[PDB]
Amino acid sequence: KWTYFGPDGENSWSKKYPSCGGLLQSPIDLHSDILQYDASLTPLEFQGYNLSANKQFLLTNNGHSVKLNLPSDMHIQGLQSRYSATQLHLHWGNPNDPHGSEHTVSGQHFAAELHIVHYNSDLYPDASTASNKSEGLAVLAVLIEMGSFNPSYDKIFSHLQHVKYKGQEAFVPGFNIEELLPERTAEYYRYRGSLTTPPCNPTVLWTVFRNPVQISQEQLLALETALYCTHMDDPSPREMINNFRQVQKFDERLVYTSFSQ
């Protein structure tokens, strides 16, 4: 029953999940002293991201997150193995402090953050298996700032009032997930880190795009007010707010960039 607030919050995770106190932890602050240009970081290609509108995909509130399941024919090409999609989810703040990205940039939080989780499907038959293995997971991260209304993100947000409580599931028609990515996807930060929730496995190759996307104040307010960590019938409801982890020590790591300036 880990949480992001109170006795069971982040400084206590490592009591039950030892990797959360181990090395290579994410998220981190992306700042100049630890950035190094790497010309071998060539463009990723996003394959089968255009999910058919006539198909539908499962949206679930598991109490800690809201995730959309993605099909294994969706993949990223460019890495040293194929990585297939398994799910996407978000992280965000609260109505009175809409600053809940996980990674920060020169010490500043963005409003929210989208993660698209993939696993090495060349080597493993499912993401759970991959998650304990060296470079088993690759997660793409999109920074989200308060700005213009975003119709593509709204294809997800329009379904949240239907997965308002833990254990609830809804179906989302397919759309082109590439619409959720920012401009100039060839410009990104890359680093070795971990899951940012229990069990904090240090098995993730992170790609954080350099450019943020925008969603509106009203979309952030919906996202921040729609969802609960607890079941529909729980007599001690908890809102699902401020579901991001603080940034972590670097432990001598660098972050490699595909952009030189």
Add this chain to the structure above:
Amino acid sequence: KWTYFGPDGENSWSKKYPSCGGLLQSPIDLHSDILQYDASLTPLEFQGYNLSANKQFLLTNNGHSVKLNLPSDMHIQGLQSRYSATQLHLHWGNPNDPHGSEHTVSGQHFAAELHIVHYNSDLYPDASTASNKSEGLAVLAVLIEMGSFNPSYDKIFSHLQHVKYKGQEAFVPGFNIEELLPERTAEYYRYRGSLTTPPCNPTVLWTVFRNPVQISQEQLLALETALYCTHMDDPSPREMINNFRQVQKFDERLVYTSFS
């Protein structure tokens, strides 16, 4: 035994020291959204800070930071109770990322940070006893940036090579500790928080001065490279670097400022 790096680092402090996972944890980012002017916050008076140059004060490396012992006649006046000095110490990063303050300002780290710890001597006999009690401690924090050479900080830093390893100790002749405080000490942030090291008791009234001080690039590099966490005969030595805690969540709370 706790450290700042590896399996014994900050995220595992709460196993042995449960307050590190509880309420009112420090340090925090001081940013505009959470700042509120409070006209009640008047200037502190630093009494007994001009330490006898005929007295010596113990500097020790405890494996976590370098600390100078301070005398109980040194005190802050201006708070509801008298708070008497017990020790000062510093936190810093490393020469590849030289930004190791504990508090940040609009998400930005300073080079380093000086803390002068005090305890409520009106209510408790010594800082150890106060440290887990209501209203027990008060810490002053000075932000440090690279700039001009600082003679006064050099009164401490010139002794660092004598306290290189864990368990080593040196003597520092009294000097005026107020020389380590910045300009316009009436300007400060105040908030209720905790120790930033085990046992992380939530018993600290924090005062962080608005203005930083300067030390030279050579002085900052000395601080970053002079000390180890380990004993002299340890086959696996460890540099004392990056001895600062990551900022904590601070939600539905204000930091009060003595300035607008």
